[PDB]
C-alpha cells in the first residue's frame, strides 16, 4: 500500500499554519487525503503544530462520531468464521486500536468497508465545526487590560510571540513596535514620554508603578489641576 | 422494520432550532416519534446542535428515571428463561445497553413491553423540565458589564455570535449595530465620540482606557468641574 | 453497504443554511458525500430547505447533464442480457428511475460503473452554476419602493422575515428596527413624526395616505411654502 | 373497527376555525386522531372549511412526503403475493389510492405496517409548515389602499366579511365600524363630512370621485390656499 | 472514426464567447467542424454557454429545416430492408433520433448519405439568421429607465453583470464606474450630491425616494423657485 509522502505531510502542515484553520483548509484536507488509511489520517492529524483548541475540538468530534457509530452499528457475538474477520468498531474506524494491516484488509476486502472515507467524513465534520467556532489568536490580537499590570502583559506578549510562527527578525520588529503601540493608555503614555529606544527593563521599571497609590494620586492631581 | 426518516429528523432539529425550547416543542416531538424504537429516539435526541446545558439537564433526567425504573422493577435471579427472553433493565430502555434487534423484539413480543413509549415519556419529562427552568441565551442578552473590560465583552459577544443560528449578512449587521448599542455608558460615550465607520481595532483602542487610573481621574475631574 | 447517516446529513443542511450557497458549499458537498449511491445524494439534496430558485436551477442542470448522457450513450442491442443487468440511463443515474439495489450493483460491479461519481459530478456542476448565478434573498434586502404602498411593503417584509431562519427574539428585534430603517422618505417621515413605540396597526394607519391626493397635495404645498 | 366519530370531527373543525392554524392545532390533531386509518385523517382534513391556501400547502407537503416515501421504498419485484397483501406506496399511504379494508389489513398485520401513523406524521409536518408559513386573513386586516377606489375596497371588505365566520349582528356591527375605520384619509375625510347614519349607497356615491381630476385639483387648491 | 477533440471544442466555445455571434463565427464553425458526425455538431452546439435567445433561434431554424427535409423526402416503403439500413429523416439529421453508429454508417457508404454536411448546412443557416437578427446583451447596455426605481435598476445591472465573461477585478471596477454613470438625471444628481466612495446600500437608500410624492414636490418647487 502507498503511505503518506513526507512532502504531503509538509504541505498539509504548511497550509494548516498559513490559513490558520480558514475554510480553505476544508478542501485542501480532502485533496491530499484521498485513498488514505485511517492510520495515515491519524499521523497526518497529529503533526499539526499548535492550535491546541482546534485539536481538542476535532478530537471531541471524532469521539462523538465514534460513539454514534458504536451505537448505530452493533457487534456480532460468536467465533469468527474463516474468510472474514472482526467488524470495525468506532475506535477501529478512528484508528485508535486498529492495526494498519487490519485497516488495509478492510479497505481491500470485497465488499469494501470504507474505514478511510468514514474517518475522513468525521474529520471533515470536525474541521467544519472548527472553522465555524474557532477564532485563532495572534500577536496582533493581544493587548493590555485597563487595570492589568504592565509586567504581566509583557510576559503574555512574550509568550504569544514565542508561540508565533515567524522569522526572528520579524519577531524582533514586532517586539519593537507592537509592545508600545498596543498597551494601556496610561502605560502607553508613560512609555511614549520616555525616550524611544529604551531597553525592556527600563520600560518595565517605568511602568512598574502604574496602578499604585502614588500614580493614582498624581494623575488625579493633574486632572483636577487641568479642569480647574 | 419501522425506522426514522431524514425528513422527520431534519424537521425535528429545525423546530428545535426555531423555537428556543419553547413549550411548542413538547407536542411536535411527541408528534414525530410515534411508535419509535428507543434507538430512533436516541438518534432523534442526539442530533440537535447547541443547547448543551438543556441537553445535559435532559440527560440527567434520563439517568434519574432509569435509576427509578431499576429500583422499582427488579431483575431476574440470573438464570435465563427457556424462551430466551431477557427482562429490560433501566439502562437498556434509553438504548445505552440494548441493541436495535432487542428493542424491536421487546416491542413486538406478546405481551408488548413498549420500551419506546417509556423512553419517550422520560424524554417528555426532561423536555418539560427544560422549558420549565432552562432559558436559552441569545445575542441580544449580551450586554457589557459595568466594570467589564471592552476586550472581554467583545470576546463574549463574538463567542455567542458564532454559535448563533443566522446568516452571514444579518450576523454582520448585528455586529455593526448591537455591539456598540449594548455597552457600558463609559464605553458607549467614547464610542459615540468616534465617528461612525470606525473599525473594531479603533473601537478597542479607544475603549482600552476606561476603568484605568487616567480615565477615572478624568471623569472625576470632569464631574467635579461640571457640578461646580 | 453503508448509507448516509443523520449527523452528516444534518451537517450538510446546516452548512447550506449558514452560508447561502457560498462557494464553500462546493467542497463540503464533495467531502460529506463519498461513495454515495445516487439515492443518497438525492436525499442529500431534497432535505435542503428554502432556496427554491437555487434548487430549481440545480434540477435543470441535472436534467441537462442527464439528457447529454442519454445522447452520448445509446441503448445497447438486446433487451435481455443474462450475463449482466441493464446499462445506466441518464435518468436512473440521477436516481429518478433507479432502485438502490441496482445502483449498488452498478457501483460494485466488475468493472465498476460509478453512477454515484457521475451524479456527484452533475450536482457539482449544478452547485457551481448556483454559486455563479443565484443570489440569495435576505431580510435586509427588503426595501420599500418609492411608489409602493406601506401595506404591501409590510406584507412582503413579514413574508421574507418569516421565511428567514433565525430565532424569535432576534426576529422581533428585526421587526422593531428594519421596518422603519427601510422605508420611503415619505413613510419614514410619517413614522418618525409618530412617537417611538407605536404599534404596527398605528404605523399602517399613519401611512395609508401615502400616494393619495391629500398627501400629494400637502407635500407639494409644503414645498412651495419652503421655496417661496 | 372503531372509525371516527362526529364529536371528534366537529371538535377538530371547531378548533381549526377558532385558533386558525395556531400552534395549538398541532397537539389536538395528534390528540383527536390516534389509531386512525388514513381515510379517517383524509376526512379530518377534507371537512376543514376555508383556509384554502393552508390546505394547498398541507396537501402539497403530503405529495412531497409521498414522493419521498416512493423514492426510498421501491416497488417489490414480483406482482405475485399469495402469502400476504401488496406493500404500500406513497399515494396509497396518503389514502388517495388504498381502500379502508386494505388500510385496516395493513395496520393490523403481523408485523403491522403503521400506515396511519406515517400519514399522521406527514400531516404533522404539513401542519408545522402551515403554522410557520401561513398567516390567516381577517376582516380587520382589510384596509383601503392609498390609490384604491372605494368601490373595489368595499367589494373586498364584503367578500372577506362573507368568508368570515361570525354572527349576523356581529357582522352588521363590523360593517358599521370597520368600513369607515379602515379608509384612506381622503375617503375618511369625505365620509366624516357626511353625517352619521348615511347609507352604503350614499357612502359609495360620496367617494366615487376620489382620484379623479376634479378631486385632485380641489385638494391641491385647498393645500395652496392653506399654505398661502 | 476520428471524433471531435477537446482543443477544437474549447476553441469553438472561446470564439463564440469572444465575438458573441459576430459574422466571423460562421467561417470558424465551418472550419473547426469538417467531416463531423451530427453528434459532433450537437456537442459543438450544446457546450455554448449563454446567448439563450440565439440558441433558441438556432434550434427553431434546425426544426424548420428538419420539417422541410421530411416534407420533401418521404419515408420509403418497407418496414424492414435486409439489403441496406434505413433512410434518414428530418429529426434524425439533427441527431435527436439517431445513434453515432448509424451516422457513421451513413456518412461512410456507397453511395454516401452526407448527413454531417446537411446538418452543418442547417446550423449554418441558423447561424446566419442569428448574426443577421440577434443582438447580444452587454453590461454597457444596462441603462436605468426614466421611471425605473433604483433598486430594480441595481438588480438588473447585477443580474447581467453576473453573467458576463470578464474577471473579478474588472467586474468590481465595472460596478464601481458604471452604476452611477448609467442612471437617471435625478438618481445621478442624488448620487453626485452624495459623497464619493459611498457603499451600495447607502446609494440605494439615497435613491429610494426618487419617484415619490416628497421628491416630486421638492423638484417641482425647486424649478418654480429657479424660474421665478
Ligand atoms: C396663488 C398664489 C398664492 C400664487 C400667487 C401667484 C402665483 C405665484 O406667484 O406664486 C403664480 C404661480 C402659481 C399659480 C402660484 C400658486 C401655485 C401654483 C402651482 C404651485 C400650483 C400647483 C401646480 O402643480 C401642479 O400642476 C401639480 C402637478 C403634480 C405638477 C400636476 O398635477 O400636474 C403648478 C403647475 C406646479 C403651479 C405652478 C404655478 C403656481 C406657482 C401663485
Closest chain A CA to residue C18: A132
Q: How far apart are CA C199 and CA C173, in angstroms?
A: 14
Is the Cβ of E222 closer than 8 Å to some Cβ of chain C?
yes
- Contacts of residues C59-64 at CB distance under 8 Å and 24 or more positions apart, as own/partner, are C59/C126, C61/C122, C61/C125, C61/C126, C61/C129, C62/C94, C62/C122, C62/C123, C62/C126
Quick check: A111 and C5 CB within 8 A?
no
Is the Cβ of D35 closer than 8 Å to some Cβ of chain B?
no
- The answer to whether C3 touches B6, Cβ cutoff 8 Å, is no
- How many residues are present in chain E? 228
Q: How far apart are CA D108 and CA D84, in angstroms?
A: 12
B165: cell is: 443560528
Q: How far apart are CA C185 and CA E216, in angstroms?
A: 12
Quick check: A121 and C8 CB within 8 A?
yes
| Other Cβ atoms within 10 Å of B53 Cβ, number | 13
Q: How far apart are CA B127 and CA A54, in angstroms?
A: 32
Residue B206 vs residues A139, A194, B78, B191, D215: alpha-carbon distances, Å: 19, 22, 73, 7, 59
| Other Cβ atoms within 10 Å of D155 Cβ, number | 11
Distance E146 CA to ligand 1 centre (A): 24
End-to-end Cα, chain E, rounded Å: 84
Report the interhelical angle of D38-46 vs D115-133 (nearest 10°): 30
- Identify the H or E element spanning E173: helix E168-178
SS3 B79: coil
Residue C115 vs residues B14, C73, C119, D70, E43: alpha-carbon distances, Å: 31, 14, 6, 20, 22
Which residues 6+ apart lie within 8 Å of B4 measured at CB? Answer: B33, B36, B40, B43, B44, C6
Quick check: C140 and B174 CB within 8 A?
no
**DSSP state string for E54-66:** HHHHHHHHHHHHH
Quick check: D215 and C214 CB within 8 A?
no
**List of chain C residues whose C-beta atoms are within 8 Å of the C-beta of residue E151:** 143, 145
Closest C-alpha to E154, from E201, E211, E194 = E201
Is the Cβ of C145 closer than 8 Å to some Cβ of chain E?
yes
- φ, ψ (nearest 5 deg) of residue E113: -110, 100
Residue C225 vs residues A81, C185, D221: alpha-carbon distances, Å: 100, 19, 13
Q: How far apart are CA D38 and CA D94, in angstroms?
A: 6
Closest C-alpha to B50, from C43, A71, C167, C46 = C167
Around B12, how many Cα atoms within 13 Å sit in the side-chain half-sphere? 26
Atom of ligand 1 nearest to the CA of D220: 22
Q: What is the CA radius of gyration of chain D?
A: 27
SS3 B7: helix
**List of chain B residues whose C-beta atoms are within 8 Å of the C-beta of residue D30:** 27, 30-31, 34
**Is D228 a pocket residue for ligand 1 (Cβ < 6 Å)?**
yes
Q: Nearest Cβ partner of B214 from A71, A185, A224? A: A185
**Is C227 a pocket residue for ligand 1 (Cβ < 6 Å)?**
no
- Whose alpha carbon is nearest atom 6 of ligand 1? D228
End-to-end Cα, chain D, rounded Å: 84
Structural determination approach: cryo-EM
- The answer to whether C45 touches C4, Cβ cutoff 8 Å, is no
Closest C-alpha to C151, from D155, E153, D137, D186 = D137
C182: cell is: 427601510
Quick check: C173 and B6 CB within 8 A?
no
Is the Cβ of D144 closer than 8 Å to some Cβ of chain C?
yes
Closest C-alpha to D126, from C167, C155, B7 = B7
| Other Cβ atoms within 10 Å of C62 Cβ, number | 23
Quick check: A114 and C35 CB within 8 A?
yes
Residue E76 per-residue DSSP state:
P
SS3 D206: helix
Is the Cβ of E220 closer than 8 Å to some Cβ of chain C?
yes
Residue A177 vs residues A210, C227, E173: alpha-carbon distances, Å: 21, 58, 36
- Whose alpha carbon is nearest atom 22 of ligand 1? D220
Q: How far apart are CA E46 and CA C67, in angstroms?
A: 11
| Other Cβ atoms within 10 Å of C106 Cβ, number | 23
- Contacts of residues D43-48 at CB distance under 8 Å and 24 or more positions apart, as own/partner, are D43/D4, D43/D9, D44/D4, D44/D9, D44/D12, D45/D123, D47/D9, D47/D12, D47/D13, D48/D12, D48/D13, D48/D16
Residue E5 per-residue DSSP state:
-
- The answer to whether A38 touches A119, Cβ cutoff 8 Å, is yes
Q: How far apart are CA D34 and CA D123, in angstroms?
A: 13
End-to-end Cα, chain B, rounded Å: 84
Is the Cβ of B19 closer than 8 Å to some Cβ of chain C?
yes
| Other Cβ atoms within 10 Å of B120 Cβ, number | 20
- Contacts of residues B172-176 at CB distance under 8 Å and 24 or more positions apart, as own/partner, are B173/C140, B174/B139, B174/C170
SS3 C117: helix
Quick check: C5 and A113 CB within 8 A?
no
Q: How far apart are CA A198 and CA C22, in angstroms?
A: 50
Residue D141 per-residue DSSP state:
G
- The residue assigned the cell 494491516 is A101
SS3 B201: helix
Closest C-alpha to E205, from D51, C143, A88, A149 = C143
Closest C-alpha to E24, from E122, E115, E130 = E130
**List of chain B residues whose C-beta atoms are within 8 Å of the C-beta of residue C165:** 17-18, 165-167
| Other Cβ atoms within 10 Å of C206 Cβ, number | 17
Quick check: D65 and B7 CB within 8 A?
yes
**DSSP state string for A127-178:** HHHHHHH-----GGG----SSS-HHHHHHHHHHHHHTS-S-HHHHHHHHHHH
E64: cell is: 424548420
Give the gap in angstroms from C-alpha B112 to the nearest C-alpha of chain C. 28
**Is D225 a pocket residue for ligand 1 (Cβ < 6 Å)?**
no
Q: How far apart are CA A153 and CA E78, in angstroms?
A: 97
Chains touching chain A, criterion 3+ CB pairs below 8 Å: B, C
B142: cell is: 449580551
- The answer to whether E95 touches E167, Cβ cutoff 8 Å, is no
Q: What is the CA radius of gyration of chain E?
A: 27
**DSSP state string for B104-148:** HHHHHSSS---HHHHHHHHHHHHHHHHHHH-----GGG----SS-
Is the Cβ of A77 closer than 8 Å to some Cβ of chain B?
no
- The residue assigned the cell 400547502 is D57
**DSSP state string for A52-116:** HHHHHHHHHHHHHHHHHHHHHS----SPPPTT--PPPPHHHHHTSS--HHHHHHHHHSSS---HH
- Contacts of residues B113-120 at CB distance under 8 Å and 24 or more positions apart, as own/partner, are B113/B88, B115/B37, B115/B38, B115/B88, B116/B33, B116/B35, B116/B36, B116/B37, B116/B38, B116/B40, B116/B41, B118/B69, B118/B93, B119/B38, B119/B41, B119/B93, B119/B94, B119/B95, B120/B30, B120/B33, B120/B36, B120/B41
Task: Tell how many helices (H) and how many strands (E) occur in chain E.
Answer: 12, 0
Buried b (16+ CB within 10 A) or exposed e, B66-95: beebeeeeeeeeeeeeeeeeeebbbebbbb
E116: cell is: 454531417
| Other Cβ atoms within 10 Å of E222 Cβ, number | 13
3-state secondary structure string across C52-78 = HHHHHHHHHHHHHHHHHHHHHCCCCCC
- The answer to whether D17 touches D49, Cβ cutoff 8 Å, is yes
- The residue assigned the cell 459577544 is B157
Closest C-alpha to B186, from B164, B168, B166, B211 = B211
Residue E35 per-residue DSSP state:
S
- Whose alpha carbon is nearest atom 33 of ligand 1? D217
Q: Nearest Cβ partner of C32 from A72, A111, A121? A: A121
Closest C-alpha to D4, from D62, D43, D31 = D43
SS3 E9: helix
**Is E220 a pocket residue for ligand 1 (Cβ < 6 Å)?**
yes
Q: Nearest Cβ partner of C20 from B17, B43, B167? A: B167
**Is E224 a pocket residue for ligand 1 (Cβ < 6 Å)?**
yes
Residue B58 vs residues B41, B123, E77: alpha-carbon distances, Å: 13, 7, 80
Query: Where do runs of H (alpha helix) occur along D110-149?
Result: 115-133
**Is D224 a pocket residue for ligand 1 (Cβ < 6 Å)?**
yes
Q: Is cis: bond before E111, omega within 30 of 0? A: yes
Closest C-alpha to C177, from B175, B182, B178 = B178
Which residues 6+ apart lie within 8 Å of C137 measured at CB? Answer: C160
Distance D215 CA to ligand 1 centre (A): 16
- The answer to whether B179 touches B159, Cβ cutoff 8 Å, is no
Closest C-alpha to D139, from D187, D185, D190, D177 = D177
Distance B56 CA to ligand 1 centre (A): 74
Amino acid at each position: 500500500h502507498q503511505a503518506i509522502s513526507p512532502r504531503t505531510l509538509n504541505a498539509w502542515v504548511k497550509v494548516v499554519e498559513e490559513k490558520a484553520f480558514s475554510p480553505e483548509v476544508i478542501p485542501m484536507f480532502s485533496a491530499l487525503s484521498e485513498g488514505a488509511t485511517p492510520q495515515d489520517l491519524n499521523t497526518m492529524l497529529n503533526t499539526v503544530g499548535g492550535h491546541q483548541a482546534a485539536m481538542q475540538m476535532l478530537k471531541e468530534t471524532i469521539n462523538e462520531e465514534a460513539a454514534e457509530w458504536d451505537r448505530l452499528h452493533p457487534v456480532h457475538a460468536g467465533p469468527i468464521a474463516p474468510g472474514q474477520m472482526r467488524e470495525p468498531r468506532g475506535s477501529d474506524i478512528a484508528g485508535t486500536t486498529s492495526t494498519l494491516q487490519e485497516q488495509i484488509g478492510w479497505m481491500t476486502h470485497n465488499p469494501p468497508i470504507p474505514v478511510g472515507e468514514i474517518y475522513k467524513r468525521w474529520i471533515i465534520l470536525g474541521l467544519n465545526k472548527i472553522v465555524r467556532m474557532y477564532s485563532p489568536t495572534s500577536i496582533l490580537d493581544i493587548r493590555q487590560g485597563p487595570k492589568e499590570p504592565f509586567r504581566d502583559y509583557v510576559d503574555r506578549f512574550y509568550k504569544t510571540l514565542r508561540a508565533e510562527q515567524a522569522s526572528q527578525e520579524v519577531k524582533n520588529w514586532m517586539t519593537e513596535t507592537l509592545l508600545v503601540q498596543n498597551a494601556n493608555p496610561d502605560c502607553k503614555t508613560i512609555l511614549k514620554a520616555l525616550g524611544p529606544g529604551a531597553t525592556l527593563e527600563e520600560m518595565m521599571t517605568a511602568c512598574q508603578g502604574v496602578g499604585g497609590p502614588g500614580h493614582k494620586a498624581r494623575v488625579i492631581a493633574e486632572a483636577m489641576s487641568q479642569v480647574t
